[PDB]
Symmetry: C2
């Protein structure tokens, strides 16, 4: 009762959650927040958390869509100017690939509906996407990255979208909960009105 216990998706927490959480704590200094970045919330016990933030639908919980994310393929211009870029999703077998959990398996769908799966062993493989982006920035190959994690790179041009007819299918980010304590109710109200 002395805190709010929340769970957020692993790679996406800092970009899509922290501005909201900072603005809430700023407005409510009396409220304490306990945050746990989670790699997969499918094995979560909802009776142990006040609010759960999750990628993709999940039970008898109040679900609220608050955003979506689409994974795109990117590479640095240095890499693009040093290799012939793939014209089809199958050409990625002949390229340096950088893969990060949970996107070790690339399921890519194009504009006319064809699905192409890549299970190649990456030249760099990590259980976190922020270091994969770091390796993609120094021109080490192509990666599949959530667009929200590389928004400023795409706008600036330090990363370039490659194979632009392809992407993983978008997923929605939900906020779940469930007599409700006041501080938890105030937080849910804050998120809805963000």
């Amino acid at each position: 009762s002395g805190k709010i216990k929340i769970s957020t998706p692993y790679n996406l927490t800092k970009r899509m959650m922290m501005p909201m959480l900072n603005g809430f704590m700023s407005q409510y200094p009396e409220i304490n927040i306990e945050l746990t970045t989670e790699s997969n919330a499918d094995q979560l016990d909802p009776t142990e958390w006040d609010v759960i933030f999750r990628v993709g639908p999940q039970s008898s919980l109040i679900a609220r869509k608050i955003g979506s994310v689409k994974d795109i393929l990117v590479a640095s211009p240095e890499y693009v100017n040093a290799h012939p870029m793939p014209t089809h999703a199958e050409d990625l077998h002949d390229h340096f690939l950088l893969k990060g959990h949970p996107l070790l398996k690339w399921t890519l769908i194009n504009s006319k509906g064809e699905t192409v799966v890549n299970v190649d062993r990456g030249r760099f493989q990590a259980n976190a996407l922020n270091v994969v982006r770091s390796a993609c920035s120094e021109g080490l190959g192509i990666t599949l990255m959530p667009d929200v994690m590389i928004k400023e790179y795409i706008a600036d041009g330090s990363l370039v979208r490659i194979l632009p007819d392809w992407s993983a299918n978008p997923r929605d980010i939900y906020m779940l909960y469930n007599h409700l304590p006041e501080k938890v109710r105030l937080f849910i109200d804050y998120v809805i009105a963000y």
Copy 2:
């Protein structure tokens, strides 16, 4: 030239290990790296890794750096409260704590220890989100100085209680008693 499987500390991988790993991969494009950021090196069986990067001492060890956790706050927060002159005044301030620094064992230049285990305003299992809340002026945090070299350089984060700190600990590269690709990596890391 094959696959290398390495383990690095959770919070320190991006700003401390990646420049070196990125340089190694660019130099040996036929060597692949499997990287696992781990929050507890004392949870690993050494025979399952080629190289393990670890904080503090642990079968072959080699020091490659050191780190000390420091207490910092944004200037916005400093300007809005009287900053603590003694380590026990931290009980009067908003605290932001991140794993594995939930328990603050702070020590001064004379070896005296002050422990802080107050509930923070914000608590998390990752320091990168705790730094974000500190930069917004939401309180004082204990943070590895290597993680915030950029903000201390221009005063975006201010060091408070300068005589106090966590106990400085060293960063070790470990390996077993050897493939050609692994020795190249080990030699590259020492020369960095």
